[PDB]
Amino acid sequence: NLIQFKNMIQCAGTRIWTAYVAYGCYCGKGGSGTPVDELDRCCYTHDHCYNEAEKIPGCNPNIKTYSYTCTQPNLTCTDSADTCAQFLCECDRTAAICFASAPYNSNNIMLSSTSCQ
Ligand code: NA
Numbered sequence: 001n002l003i004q005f006k007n008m009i010q011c012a013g014t015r016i017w018t019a020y021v022a023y024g025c026y027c028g029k030g031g032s033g034t035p036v037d038e039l040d041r042c043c044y045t046h047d048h049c050y051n052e053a054e055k056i057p058g059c060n061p062n063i064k065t066y067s068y069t070c071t072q073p074n075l076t077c078t079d080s081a082d083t084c085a086q087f088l089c090e091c092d093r094t095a096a097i098c099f100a101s102a103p104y105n106s107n108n109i110m111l112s113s114t115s116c117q
Pocket of ligand 1: 027028030043047
C-alpha cells in the first residue's frame, strides 16, 4: 500500500515522503542510469522489489494492504500467511529503514543530468 509506505517512512526516520518524491536517479517515478549515492541505491532496490512483487499472483504493490506495526523508530511486518503482504511489507520496511540511515545530499536533488543515463 502506497499510503502505508509513506507512514512507514516517518516512523523509521525524520524526513517525510515528500523529501524523496524527487531525488537522484531512482527516488520518484521510474528510474534509470546508476544510483548516484547510498540513498539513491535505497530507491533502486525498492523499485526492483516492487517489480518482483508483481511476479506474485494477484499482487499489486500500490493497492495491496498489509499488516505492520510502528513502535517508532521500530517497524515490524506481522504478515506471515499472505505472501504478497509479507513480501510487499518487507520491500517497504527495508526502504524506510534504508532511507533513514542513508545521507541526504540536497545536491543530488532533482538532477536529468548525465548521471542518470
Ligand atoms: Na522509483
